[PDB]
Amino acid sequence: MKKSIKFKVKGNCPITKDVINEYKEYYNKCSDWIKNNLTSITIGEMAKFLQETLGKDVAYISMGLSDEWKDKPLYHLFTKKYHTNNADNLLYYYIKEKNLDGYKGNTLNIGNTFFRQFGYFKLVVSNYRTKIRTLNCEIKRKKIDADSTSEDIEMQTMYEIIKHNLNKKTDWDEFISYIENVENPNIDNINRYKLLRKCFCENENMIKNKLELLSIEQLKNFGGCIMKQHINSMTLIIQHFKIEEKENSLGFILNLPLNKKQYQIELWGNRQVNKGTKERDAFLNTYGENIVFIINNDELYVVFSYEYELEKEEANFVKTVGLDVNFKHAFFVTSEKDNCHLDGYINLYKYLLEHDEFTNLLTNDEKKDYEELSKVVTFCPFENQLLFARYNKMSKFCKKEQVLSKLLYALQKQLKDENRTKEYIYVSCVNKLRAKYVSYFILKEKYYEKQKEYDIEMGFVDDSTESKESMDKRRTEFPFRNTPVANELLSKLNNVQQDINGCLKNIINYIYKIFEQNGYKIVALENLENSNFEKKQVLPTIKSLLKYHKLENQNVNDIKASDKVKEYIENGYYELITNENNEIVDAKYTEKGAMKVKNANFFNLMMKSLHFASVKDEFVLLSNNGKTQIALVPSEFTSQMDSTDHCLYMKKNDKGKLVKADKKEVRTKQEKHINGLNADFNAANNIKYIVENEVWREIFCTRPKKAEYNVPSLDTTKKGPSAILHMLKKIEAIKILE
RNA sequence: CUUGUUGUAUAUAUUCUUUUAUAGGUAUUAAACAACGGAGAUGAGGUGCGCGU
DNA sequence: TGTCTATTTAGGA
DNA sequence: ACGCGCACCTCATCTCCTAAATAGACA
Ligand SMILES: Nc1ccn([C@H]2C[C@H](O[P@](O)(=S)OC[C@H]3O[C@@H](n4cnc5c(N)ncnc54)C[C@@H]3O)[C@@H](CO[P@@](O)(=S)O[C@H]3C[C@H](n4ccc(N)nc4=O)O[C@@H]3CO[P@@](O)(=S)O[C@H]3C[C@H](n4cnc5c(N)ncnc54)O[C@@H]3CO[P@@](O)(=S)O[C@H]3C[C@H](n4ccc(N)nc4=O)O[C@@H]3CO[P@@](O)(=S)O[C@H]3C[C@H](n4cnc5c(=O)[nH]c(N)nc54)O[C@@H]3COP(=O)(O)S)O2)c(=O)n1
Ligand SMILES: [Mg+2]
Ligand SMILES: [Mg+2]
Ligand SMILES: [Mg+2]
Ligand SMILES: [Mg+2]
Ligand SMILES: [Mg+2]
Ligand SMILES: [Mg+2]
Ligand SMILES: [Mg+2]
Ligand SMILES: [Mg+2]
Questions:
Q1: Could you please report the per-residue DSSP string of A375-435?
Q2: SS3 for A79?
Q3: Domain coordinates of chain A in residue numbers?
Q4: Which atom belonging to ligand 1 lies closest to the Cα atom of A600?
Q5: Do A638 and A687 form a contact (C-beta atoms < 8 A)?
Q6: Dihedral angle computed from the Cα positions of residues A241, A247, A251 and A254, in that order, rounded to the nearest 10 degrees
Q7: Nucleotide nearest to A126 (CA to C1')
Q8: Are A30 and A120 in contact (CB under 8 A)?
Q9: Which residues in chain A have their C atom more than 2.5 Å from the N of the next written residue, marking a break after them?
Q10: Any idea which nucleotide's C1' is nearest the CA of A601?
């Protein structure tokens, strides 16, 4: 098992940004040639050239000339079948003997073995291996009719296999049976999928073969692996260099060969690598060959690698607890009732309801909901609705937000005074995160506004469309990303996001240490894999209100409605400029609806910026060294299942059978579930059941392996709403909703 | 070399910043508590803006 | 010439 | 809604982190 330590170089090093730009340009040229000749040259055609020009009897020329690899194209060098070193040597010596990457040496005259062969070429090769060893095809979706040609139905069956992972016979039984029991089902699409199931059960192997062949065919238009302009780093592999402790110091000295002689590079010390620590022995004894020089914030850092052991424990299943991630009332809700049993735990919802100034502003419903929440072990009182009052000055929650903030900051002051440091850090990070997200939202909105201003100012004119050959030249030559205005906004956004990430890590560390210290052996979590939810909140933009909805040519007095759009028309959302002959010329966003668009952007961005799916990763990282292991469970029907029956709710539609009811019929409001409990305290007990129950543990979660770094003790087996719905019915965990 | 990175002060000034305003930048003041496998690339998504329908 | 650094090679049949 | 082009960000996934022998260069 490997690891990294990053060091800060102390004095001056000859490795500047030119030494790295040269490395990047060489990478780009080599990868350019590799992609341009991915299919045009066969392996034997290169091995023969090496044999004739050099006359060497070696395995890397004696493998490309064998009949197994003789006529296959270049890209088979990166496939997992070909020997790694033989392919590296064959490709490198063909490239070298032909001088195809335009190499003229490096400025520091580092040994070509370390700068070129085991340097940027060894990275080009690995980047083309990851591209090729996992190769896919891009298929555009297309609406079909009943009388559709077999090829289009054949192609759209390929499209569906990619997007829904339907490769067995049963994976089409489940997906059909999951979108068909929907109450008032959509007949437009179910027929399409029933038709596409016919092709799969008729032309299965043909489908797979055509998938693979199309994936190879599209590779001709592949642009190649490109090293980004913002990378500012360089990797060298050197077999013989030494790292020694700087005498009478906590730092280190790096001796590497430059220009056929040793150059001393002095490094600072790391508290990870301290004199009396086994970590220093492990680093010094067994440091690896790869050396990374990376420039970050105008500071040179050198990364090494070494071998260290892992002692991650194994799951015990004696004391478990679930955890759900929300955004409206609390960031993390656990499956534990707050009974003053967690040492070092501070309940902020108990605290906030002890103040009469806070409960006064709450309605009789809100009071009851907050008191419901306060009886549960909870964390990080994120308030999505209250927080947006900071940006929206004319909001209905502005006064409640101020009271909340004042009480939280006062608790912060008190905890600081009383020397309860962990709770103080937790409270301060909650407070900082709440404002940092608002800062991020303001900065990103400014980015959007500035980009619109710049794009409108430049005034692009296109001769035609559908191809970059027709689009205006200045779009690629002068992007907004290169403007000085954009760069500072992006840097401020980076700073804000860095603060956000640190605060989230502090909160998660607090939670993990609380549960570890109180005897909990496992923490269960949803296997969250995506946080880029579609922005379902729609307020049609100005252009879409004149070029798509055709509201431009309508009469001002008598407007042709389009379903819900008339509701927007009635409300003061758009200040439609009228025309002389009772028509509409131009549309303007009224401020009342502009605030609604802002709220849509705010909530949409909160999902991503707070790393909704990455909470499990932080818990896993803390579990690498801790005493509590993290179990990942399926993230379907945990906020829809009863937590005492342990059953999903199925109703009957018309003269139908048991069908899955709508999610809004089990969660009447976001804070409650039909069985009474909180909609999150309900989910947290669903998450706990999958790992608490021995029988359910095997069905939904992978078997316990040997411990591994950054890998949960348990992980999910099957993925997708349809897959979970079937396994629920086999143990008959289903109840009839009235 | 009481040594790297990140987070944590509603601390002191500020004719600084609504392009971080319960926060930052600009200089000062203090204490620790934590976490720390890095780099590159590929792919899938979402979202912003422009141009056409 | 001796020591030090840089370059070549690594297989399965 | 769609297409198209320019960018930003979040997630999953993969590669890779060796070692010996010999050739060349300089003192
Ligand atoms: N719904 C709704 C609600 C609400 N809303 C609204 C409200 C408000 O309003 P305003 O704007 S302010 O006002 C104005 C106007 O409007 C109107 N209205 C009202 N209301 C309404 C409605 N409802 N509708 C319409 N309209 C309306 C009137 C007036 O005048 C807004 C907002 O605001 P605020 O601030 S308050 O906010 C809030 C709300 C929100 N939400 C909610 C929900 C939803 N859905 N959505 C939304 O938005 O939020 C907030 C709060 O927070 P929270 O805590 S609740 O959070 C949560 C949720 C979220 N989400 C989800 N989803 C989504 C989307 N789509 N988008 C976005 N977001 C979201 O997130 C979080 C999480 O939690 P949970 O626990 S639930 O978890 C979950 C998640 C996950 N998933 C999902 C999905 C997907 N795709 N993915 C994923 O991952 O999972 C988990 C679990 O679940 P469950 O258990 S239920 O299960 C289920 C699901 C699954 N699936 C599916 N698919 C899939 C995939 O692919 N994958 C996976 N893995 N999975 C999955 O499965 C199962 C089944 O399914 P089905 O059934 O088939 S679908 O607005 C609205 O609008 N809406
Ligand atoms: Mg959840
Ligand atoms: Mg910061
Ligand atoms: Mg995962
Ligand atoms: Mg919940
Ligand atoms: Mg630092
Ligand atoms: Mg520091
Ligand atoms: Mg101040
Ligand atoms: Mg502001």
A1: TEEEE----HHHHTTTT-TT-TTHHHHHHHHHHHHHHHHHHHHTT-HHHHHHHHHHHHHHH
A2: coil
A3: 1-145+212-309, 150-211, 543-598
A4: 11
A5: yes
A6: -20
A7: D15
A8: yes
A9: none
A10: B47
